[PDB]
Design a protein around this ligand. Structure first.
Ligand SMILES: C[C@H](C(=O)O)c1cccc(C(=O)c2ccccc2)c1
Ligand SMILES: C[C@H](C(=O)O)c1cccc(C(=O)c2ccccc2)c1
Ligand SMILES: C[C@H](C(=O)O)c1cccc(C(=O)c2ccccc2)c1
Lengths: 389, 389, 387
């Protein structure tokens, strides 16, 4: 019953493992626990500003996935839609394996494959993956200044690493999804996110560029995990040194937009999104997604074998995959406190959130550390679970 | 919360993909959404008439299957009854495989096998099926003027494509069921349907021939999918050209009757049948099928492997098979909005219906297009699901 | 008809190879031989007398034979763990295509090196979980790095399977050359000179050019590049001179490798191939006993349905012995051969074979990297058909 959340965060700051941390836990749509620890940057020790801004990386994916579900509801496409219907550059895909064998794909990539990371795409930083070296040579993630549409043209020429539908591998497929959304609608994904999600939820600080007053609110990002170079064979030491993002994550590029990363947000903005996922509605009662399609989106859809869900061989114990991210399907296999049906996702800079329908609960932890050797997100979830009976 | 049903239907009509569409959604036995779009025929653009008549094709199957369950309840036969007990022409069946090997069947075909499409029968238009070419040579479906009893004599001489009970393949077995009903009762299947189902439910426009005033109400049927010829290796283009049914679907043949297709019906008539499936009762409370046997009929009975339920390799994602048609058994595998336990079926001319017990809901979409490249039925179900919370 | 000349002249006439030499011996004496084309298409110089070729992986049967001689002499044995000779190869790790890394559950042995079952990879192995890290380390590209130092960099990288459990064509012959140096205290080039080249009078074979060698070196063509990533589809087969960077020096007195790097001539390599019919020099001096030669030639790795493959190219009907390929099923073979035919080939399209049933040897010398045409096998097939 003590405040384990503050204890976790203060200990991380006091041990020089994270510069600054913010968190909020809501229940029934209202804050029940919240706090902050540390500073905006350790170089000057400026205090965490009001409505501090974070690079949320793959916490972009549940947002872009939710947009796709809205467009499915509105009839733009369906889960079974072949993506080549919208961009013929994804016609005639090939599949490569670890033995240098290449053959034509025997199934078409669908919207559902993109949402479930079963399309056969890879990721630039996937260690040991048969094709990731070719992704890195193409600078798919590193070259943030390249237009989404043009990056997709380069990706489309590369082989998949399995036949669509047959395996699971966490991937660039959410970026493909953002692009296919643009093809299917004739609109830009950032404009669609603004009009259909951010504005109805009053997420005024969320987007692919900083707000006008955003520079002074941007949290510094730390860590040794590097985008420029080969995936490491052992984790870099966990040290608070400012991270060099190269040109991968611009702050003021009006055309920068992605599906798998790239949003800036705030704790308050992301909690508005997370709370919405408990119902599909805005706080006033506008429906962003009907209950039936929200249930379709949250139902466990990819189930895993004995070794479970893994990303670069890191486990997500007891989790299955739904159309928006992870979902807890076996508390008896879980590695940290949770409840059946808890869902959410996380980002490369150690941001983390969850939604727990059994407790009408949402939680989010914001920090900026790339390559963390400490699972701060899960530690904060566990603390909150222990505090909510 | 907008009227997604009207949007789906109007868009289909405005894009010249369907000539005319009617739909109705009922909840608690009363209409909650309904509409119509387009025309009876694009040649004259005559408006959709009152109580327009549709060829419902395989939406005949749930009706004939329901009749069989009524006869099981009344003791005429049982699920385990070997059909050869009623027609010895189905004694001594043979089984053929894709390697030209023929051997005697090692199990007897039962009523249950017929209801579950596990008897080993095929269908004339089954692409790649070892025996479908012999079905087509025999004109089993094409020759609508042939008496059901005589068509069955020709079918009975052909081999099955697997041993009864061992596999699932959507088939002519509902026509065998209609015939075996005639053998077991000494009555005609159309008279039994009239007396036991249509008349109690006041389905006055449903039958294997047009009503006296029916000609002016019959919707035109469109599409390129052809009965006369080999199953196509790629889908014919989706174009609104009137379809030539040959002699396969007579309008005024007093002896035409089948189990798997051939009924004419109306939106209002079919909704009466669908609403009945929520309880087994007529609106006044007469019992057509007891709750226990209705539960037996709706329980998931055939379960599918990783590739799922497929018909000509088209998927029915998340569906299992019960004694009347499809039933949703995993929302997390579903490809469009649904709820656990949703059941129903559909027909070759794109008619579609569903029953959703979790919402006390029924829905039906009526149109006439053979070989549709657009899944209008599932699109309308998804719209209705999104509108009903 | 002279099928050999017809194959070679067609290859030259279609602008697919600049110059080709071949010789086929039976009972130690030439029965077929010829040349076609030129040393270089730029100046159209004729193929010189005693023309010199980069033989690339035809280095491997020579270094493997040396290892068998050292086994016979007791320096080490097939079962020797290589970590006994270089402890940098203690505590190896294994990586897989799912980013999982774990300790190796078996020690790498001499036999593993000779059979490419040690778990090593190659820089240009397309799709291989670890080849990107080989290329980042420039293991093959950096020819000026001493063998010993290159091995230190390699030893820190994970294997791609547990030693002994799979087959993958690999840098393991370079590891073998290095372990030979550790075990003997001598350099591999000096050992090759004393034990093989001098007894066989292979005066033009070595890791550097002879003093008069520059004018005899054949030009090398092709677009397959060591620099960048392995290509997802073959580069066009066009006669453009190849850029070897610093991978294959001509006059570095310390350059030595196990898997590539020798210069040789047609005559020199035929002396080596003819020796493999007996283990003896033409004068009758024994280089390797009959018993150990049999041990070296016996089929040792057998392959599944996919068969033996290197970057997914098949070697149909071939198994692997301690020196290279060996034909074990003529009914699976894709070109004329006999049971027991053995040999190997190199990246610049050089090829040789030994056919014990016919007391026959053959070698085709050319210089083309990334060939889209199997000139070696076409010439073997032509020679087989002319018997
Ligand atoms: C998967 C990972 C995440 O969001 O978890 C992700 C997605 C997209 C981009 C990036 C990066 O920019 C990055 C930065 C430093 C090192 C490696 C990658 C990381
Ligand atoms: C399976 C299919 C259905 O009801 O789904 C069906 C059942 C019975 C008859 C027919 C046809 O007449 C037909 C018409 C045109 C092309 C192919 C078949 C079609
Ligand atoms: C496997 C291959 C062979 O001998 O078959 C080989 C072994 C060693 C070195 C090289 C190269 O230098 C090279 C040159 C151009 C392209 C790629 C590699 C090639």
């Amino acid at each position: 019953m003590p405040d384990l959340l503050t204890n976790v965060a203060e200990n991380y700051v006091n041990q020089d493992l994270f510069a600054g941390i913010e968190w909020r836990i809501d229940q029934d749509g209202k804050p029940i626990f919240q706090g902050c620890a540390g500073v905006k940057d350790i170089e000057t020790r400026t205090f965490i500003p009001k409505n501090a801004i974070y690079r949320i990386y793959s916490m972009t994916k549940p947002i872009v996935s939710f947009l796709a579900m809205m467009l499915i509801e509105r009839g733009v496409f369906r889960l079974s839609s072949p993506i080549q219907n919208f961009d013929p550059r994804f016609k005639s895909m090939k599949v490569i394996d670890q033995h240098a064998h290449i053959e034509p794909a025997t199934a078409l990539i669908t919207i559902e494959h993109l949402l479930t990371h079963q399309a056969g795409f890879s990721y630039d930083f996937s260690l040991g993956c048969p094709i990731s070296a070719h992704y890195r040579d193409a600078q798919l993630i590193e070259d943030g200044g390249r237009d989404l549409t043009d990056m997709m043209g380069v990706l489309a020429e590369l082989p998949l690493v399995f036949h669509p539908g047959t395996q699971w591998k966490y991937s660039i497929s959410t970026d493909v999804l953002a692009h296919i959304i643009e093809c299917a609608t004739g609109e830009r994904v950032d404009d669609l996110l603004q009009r259909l999600i951010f504005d109805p939820l009053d997420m005024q600080d969320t987007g692919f560029s900083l707000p006008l007053d955003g520079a002074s609110r941007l949290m510094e990002v730390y860590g040794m995990r590097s985008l420029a170079g080969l995936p490491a064979l052992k984790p870099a030491p966990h040290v608070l040194v400012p991270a060099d993002l190269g040109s991968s994550h611009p702050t003021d590029d009006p055309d920068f937009r992605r599906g798998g990363h790239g949003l800036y947000s705030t704790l308050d903005d992301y909690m508005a999104f997370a709370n919405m996922l408990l119902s599909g509605q805005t706080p006033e009662g506008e429906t962003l997604l009907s209950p039936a399609v929200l249930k379709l989106a949250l139902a466990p859809r990819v189930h895993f074998g004995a070794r479970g869900m893994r990303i670069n061989d890191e486990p997500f114990a007891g989790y299955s995959w739904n159309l928006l991210g992870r979902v807890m399907t076996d508390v008896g296999a879980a590695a940290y406190a949770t409840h059946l049906g808890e869902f959410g996702w996380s980002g490369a800079a150690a941001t983390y959130f969850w939604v727990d329908p059994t407790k009408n609960m949402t939680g989010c932890v914001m920090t900026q550390f790339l390559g963390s050797q400490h699972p701060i997100g899960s530690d904060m979830q566990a603390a909150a679970m222990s505090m909510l009976g």
